[PDB]
Scaffold this motif. Structure first.
Motif, PDB file in Angstrom:
ATOM      1  N   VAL A 124     -11.832 -30.287  32.340  1.00 22.03           N
ATOM      2  CA  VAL A 124     -11.565 -29.093  31.537  1.00 22.03           C
ATOM      3  C   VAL A 124     -10.089 -29.083  31.112  1.00 22.03           C
ATOM      4  O   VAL A 124      -9.217 -29.470  31.886  1.00 22.03           O
ATOM      5  N   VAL A 125      -9.806 -28.655  29.885  1.00 25.94           N
ATOM      6  CA  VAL A 125      -8.431 -28.358  29.493  1.00 25.94           C
ATOM      7  C   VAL A 125      -8.272 -26.844  29.427  1.00 25.94           C
ATOM      8  O   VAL A 125      -9.005 -26.184  28.705  1.00 25.94           O
ATOM      9  N   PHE A 126      -7.349 -26.282  30.193  1.00 24.81           N
ATOM     10  CA  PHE A 126      -7.035 -24.867  30.032  1.00 24.81           C
ATOM     11  C   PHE A 126      -5.979 -24.730  28.950  1.00 24.81           C
ATOM     12  O   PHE A 126      -4.962 -25.424  28.970  1.00 24.81           O
ATOM     13  N   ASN A 127      -6.262 -23.871  27.979  1.00 20.80           N
ATOM     14  CA  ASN A 127      -5.370 -23.664  26.848  1.00 20.80           C
ATOM     15  C   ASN A 127      -4.372 -22.588  27.222  1.00 20.80           C
ATOM     16  O   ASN A 127      -4.620 -21.395  27.040  1.00 20.80           O
ATOM     17  N   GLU A 128      -3.241 -23.024  27.758  1.00 21.13           N
ATOM     18  CA  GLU A 128      -2.334 -22.106  28.433  1.00 21.13           C
ATOM     19  C   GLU A 128      -1.713 -21.103  27.464  1.00 21.13           C
ATOM     20  O   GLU A 128      -1.448 -19.970  27.845  1.00 21.13           O
ATOM     21  N   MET A 129      -1.518 -21.506  26.209  1.00 18.33           N
ATOM     22  CA  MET A 129      -0.957 -20.599  25.208  1.00 18.33           C
ATOM     23  C   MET A 129      -1.955 -19.486  24.870  1.00 18.33           C
ATOM     24  O   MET A 129      -1.558 -18.411  24.439  1.00 18.33           O
ATOM     25  N   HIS A 130      -3.244 -19.754  25.068  1.00 21.29           N
ATOM     26  CA  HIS A 130      -4.286 -18.773  24.772  1.00 21.29           C
ATOM     27  C   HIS A 130      -4.974 -18.247  26.028  1.00 21.29           C
ATOM     28  O   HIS A 130      -6.199 -18.271  26.131  1.00 21.29           O
ATOM     29  N   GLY A 131      -4.161 -17.791  26.976  1.00 21.20           N
ATOM     30  CA  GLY A 131      -4.637 -17.108  28.167  1.00 21.20           C
ATOM     31  C   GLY A 131      -5.385 -17.980  29.149  1.00 21.20           C
ATOM     32  O   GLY A 131      -6.255 -17.496  29.869  1.00 21.20           O
ATOM     33  N   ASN A 132      -5.032 -19.262  29.196  1.00 25.23           N
ATOM     34  CA  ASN A 132      -5.733 -20.222  30.034  1.00 25.23           C
ATOM     35  C   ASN A 132      -7.224 -20.267  29.759  1.00 25.23           C
ATOM     36  O   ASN A 132      -8.016 -20.467  30.669  1.00 25.23           O
ATOM     37  N   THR A 133      -7.606 -20.072  28.505  1.00 29.75           N
ATOM     38  CA  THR A 133      -9.002 -20.192  28.127  1.00 29.75           C
ATOM     39  C   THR A 133      -9.468 -21.604  28.447  1.00 29.75           C
ATOM     40  O   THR A 133      -8.866 -22.565  27.964  1.00 29.75           O
ATOM     41  N   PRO A 134     -10.519 -21.748  29.279  1.00 28.68           N
ATOM     42  CA  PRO A 134     -10.927 -23.121  29.608  1.00 28.68           C
ATOM     43  C   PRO A 134     -11.609 -23.794  28.419  1.00 28.68           C
ATOM     44  O   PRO A 134     -12.424 -23.163  27.752  1.00 28.68           O
ATOM     45  N   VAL A 135     -11.235 -25.036  28.119  1.00 30.16           N
ATOM     46  CA  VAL A 135     -11.914 -25.805  27.080  1.00 30.16           C
ATOM     47  C   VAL A 135     -12.683 -26.962  27.722  1.00 30.16           C
ATOM     48  O   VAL A 135     -12.089 -27.883  28.275  1.00 30.16           O
ATOM     49  N   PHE A 136     -14.008 -26.908  27.675  1.00 38.43           N
ATOM     50  CA  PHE A 136     -14.802 -27.828  28.490  1.00 38.43           C
ATOM     51  C   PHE A 136     -14.906 -29.216  27.870  1.00 38.43           C
ATOM     52  O   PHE A 136     -15.275 -29.364  26.702  1.00 38.43           O
ATOM     53  N   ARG A 137     -14.539 -30.228  28.654  1.00 35.26           N
ATOM     54  CA  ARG A 137     -14.633 -31.619  28.206  1.00 35.26           C
ATOM     55  C   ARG A 137     -15.710 -32.419  28.960  1.00 35.26           C
ATOM     56  O   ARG A 137     -16.878 -32.420  28.561  1.00 35.26           O
ATOM     57  N   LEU A 138     -15.321 -33.119  30.020  1.00 43.50           N
ATOM     58  CA  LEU A 138     -16.276 -33.944  30.768  1.00 43.50           C
ATOM     59  C   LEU A 138     -17.129 -33.081  31.709  1.00 43.50           C
ATOM     60  O   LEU A 138     -18.217 -33.484  32.129  1.00 43.50           O
ATOM     61  N   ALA A 139     -16.623 -31.899  32.050  1.00 42.14           N
ATOM     62  CA  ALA A 139     -17.446 -30.896  32.705  1.00 42.14           C
ATOM     63  C   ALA A 139     -17.910 -29.881  31.657  1.00 42.14           C
ATOM     64  O   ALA A 139     -17.133 -29.489  30.783  1.00 42.14           O
ATOM     65  N   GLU A 140     -19.177 -29.479  31.730  1.00 50.51           N
ATOM     66  CA  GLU A 140     -19.725 -28.506  30.788  1.00 50.51           C
ATOM     67  C   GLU A 140     -19.612 -27.070  31.294  1.00 50.51           C
ATOM     68  O   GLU A 140     -19.703 -26.125  30.515  1.00 50.51           O
ATOM     69  N   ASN A 141     -19.415 -26.905  32.597  1.00 52.55           N
ATOM     70  CA  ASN A 141     -19.295 -25.571  33.172  1.00 52.55           C
ATOM     71  C   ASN A 141     -18.728 -25.648  34.577  1.00 52.55           C
ATOM     72  O   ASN A 141     -18.748 -26.717  35.195  1.00 52.55           O
ATOM     73  N   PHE A 142     -18.201 -24.530  35.072  1.00 52.87           N
ATOM     74  CA  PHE A 142     -17.911 -24.400  36.500  1.00 52.87           C
ATOM     75  C   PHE A 142     -18.134 -22.974  36.992  1.00 52.87           C
ATOM     76  O   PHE A 142     -18.094 -22.017  36.219  1.00 52.87           O
TER      77      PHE A 142
END
Ligand SMILES: CC(=O)N[C@@H]1[C@@H](O)[C@H](O[C@@H]2O[C@H](CO)[C@@H](O)[C@H](O)[C@H]2NC(C)=O)[C@@H](CO)O[C@H]1O
Ligand SMILES: [Ca+2]
Ligand SMILES: [Ca+2]
Ligand SMILES: [Cl-]
Ligand SMILES: [Mg+2]
Length: 527
Positions: free
Chosen positions: A39-57
């Protein structure tokens, strides 16, 4: 084919090493680009998680499980599955030298639940642990298990999950890292190769960037409007606000006289009042920064977290006041007793503070030279050193330095700065970075930090923050100077799609340690 010229890190020569755990010796195109995160957390946008190799947690509390995206392959062709994740986390738990964060302090262990799903067991309550987990590199088991020595494995022919795994060209002064032939998100990728030139310092960088030879960079550039921007209509930049910068003093200096000075809170406060933070910003950074007069190092971008009574109480100590600095020195008893104009310790000893910043980081070099002059104005003797980064870094790890100028990681809340800068547990370990190496220790402070994400109670977390602020401020542990910028330059000659002020999708930088650079490169299109 389209080649994107990037510059993540200075080197004098490239050594072929794509080992994700060896952060002090690898190339800085390994994380993200060869090894994609869950997952990439988009820190500039409130740590919105952006899912990559994981689809969910999914948390629970104590427990968290990640669902793995199915149908993902490694660059060789083999399938990406859940035991790669399990394999990866075991490694670092057993060899805590590959722990570059402190992750082993949170995750007690890890278990495969099935071919596409993994559970994570915690040490303590941490609502922030998915963010910590995303930091750990995931390597393929059908390679690294056959590997005899991970602590020294250079991995010169990497098998990766990310967009660029193919080593097309490699010389001591240039390498080109091309598209993974099996990349799972290939329909989203429009760049063919990353092109990575060897550049050793800011001077060498300046000539290249001004000549339009670069595409995506994040270096300091002096007088950027007149030097770089004015050279071509294709030359752009965007500098969103970043983290704290400070002088850090070694509380365990081996020299008796320097220890006597540096461990003295009156001396640290007078050091701090000698500094002219706005002048430093104006001259060393050409305006590219904001004054940080928080004794706790908090900075003005976290106004909402700040206990303003604390900030106000210690702000005089973190404001330019050369006459007040001289009075405080006099009151504390740092008296010049050998007629040279520089104060000596209470015990009568002369000393000179050696202040270090990394070689080639010219904005920090100039800051240190400005502070040297300012300190001499109040009778504190110092002089500058600009050692090679690894030397600079090692001196802090080993505690042989006097004072060092440094920046810090910056997050969506104050924890990223405060934990990395002050948690005393990060002062021991050989995978540890420089940031906590003042060797100040306060058990109450560590406890507050270790409790920051302990309850799901916003008011309590705010009170914990106020407590952390109080402790650091009253002890003037470091000398905060300014809040810096995410330097970022981009060129529209060869590519379009760039993040910028009108398209501020996230932190735009090319540095390793900025996971969003994976999301950025996926937005770029050849002209
Ligand atoms: C928090 C941290 O350590 N960040 C590092 C970056 O500061 C660093 O980039 C370099 O920053 C210097 C200080 O502003 C600049 O003078 C320098 O030009 C810049 N270098 C490059 C190649 O961008 C990067 C790279 O050394 O490492 C980060 O970890
Ligand atoms: Ca795209
Ligand atoms: Ca003297
Ligand atoms: Cl300018
Ligand atoms: Mg060259």
């Amino acid at each position: 084919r389209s080649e994107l010229t990037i510059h993540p890190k200075e080197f004098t020569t490239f050594v072929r090493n794509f080992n994700p755990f060896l952060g002090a010796t690898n190339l800085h195109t390994t994380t993200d680009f060869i090894y994609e995160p869950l997952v990439v957390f988009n820190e500039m946008h409130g740590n919105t998680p952006v899912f990559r190799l994981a689809e969910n947690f999914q948390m629970s509390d104590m427990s968290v499980t990640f669902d793995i995206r199915k149908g993902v392959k490694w660059s060789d062709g083999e399938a990406f599955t859940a035991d790669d994740v399990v394999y990866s986390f075991n490694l670092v738990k057993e060899k805590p030298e590959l722990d570059q964060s402190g992750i082993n302090s949170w995750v007690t262990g890890v278990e495969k639940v099935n071919d596409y799903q993994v559970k994570f067991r915690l040490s303590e309550a941490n609502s922030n642990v998915p963010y910590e987990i995303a930091k750990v590199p995931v390597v393929p088991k059908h390679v690294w298990s056959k590997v005899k020595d991970p602590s020294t494995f250079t991995n010169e022919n990497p098998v990766g999950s990310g967009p660029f795994t193919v080593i097309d060209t490699f010389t001591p002064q240039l390498y080109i890292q091309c598209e993974n032939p099996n990349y799972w998100d290939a329909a989203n990728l429009d760049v063919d190769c990353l092109r990575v030139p060897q550049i050793a310092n800011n001077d060498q960088f300046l000539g290249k960037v001004v000549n339009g030879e670069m595409d995506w960079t994040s270096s300091f550039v002096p007088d950027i409007d007149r030097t770089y921007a004015a050279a071509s209509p294709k030359h752009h930049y965007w500098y969103p606000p970043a983290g704290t910068q400070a002088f850090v003093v070694n509380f365990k200096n081996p020299d008796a006289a320097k220890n006597e000075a540096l461990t003295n809170v009156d001396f640290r406060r007078a050091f701090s009042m000698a500094l002219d933070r706005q002048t430093i910003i104006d001259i060393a950074f050409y305006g590219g920064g904001t004054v940080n007069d928080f004794a706790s190092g908090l900075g003005y971008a976290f106004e909402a977290w700040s206990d303003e009574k604390t900030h106000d109480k210690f702000k005089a100590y973190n404001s330019y006041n050369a006459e007040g600095a001289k009075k405080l020195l006099a009151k504390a008893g740092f008296k010049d007793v050998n007629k040279d104009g520089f104060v000596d310790t209470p015990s009568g000893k002369s000393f000179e503070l050696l202040i270090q910043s990394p070689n080639g980081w010219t904005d920090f070099n100039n800051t240190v030279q400005l502070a040297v002059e300012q300190l001499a104005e109040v009778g504190i003797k110092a002089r500058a050193r600009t050692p090679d980064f690894s030397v600079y870094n090692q001196a802090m790890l080993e505690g042989t330095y006097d004072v060092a100028y440094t920046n810090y990681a910056h997050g969506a809340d104050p924890y990223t700065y405060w934990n990395s800068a002050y948690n005393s547990a990060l002062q021991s370990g050989d995978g540890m970075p420089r940031f906590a190496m003042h060797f100040y220790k306060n058990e109450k402070l560590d406890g507050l930090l270790n409790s920051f994400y302990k309850t799901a109670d916003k008011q309590e977390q705010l009170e914990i923050a106020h407590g952390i602020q109080q402790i650091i401020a009253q002890d003037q542990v470091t000398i905060p100077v300014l809040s810096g910028a995410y330097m970022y330059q981009y060129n529209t000659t060869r590519f379009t799609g760039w993040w910028n002020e009108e398209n501020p999708k996230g932190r735009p930088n090319i540095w390793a340690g900025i996971p969003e650079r994976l999301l950025h490169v996926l937005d770029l299109k050849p002209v």
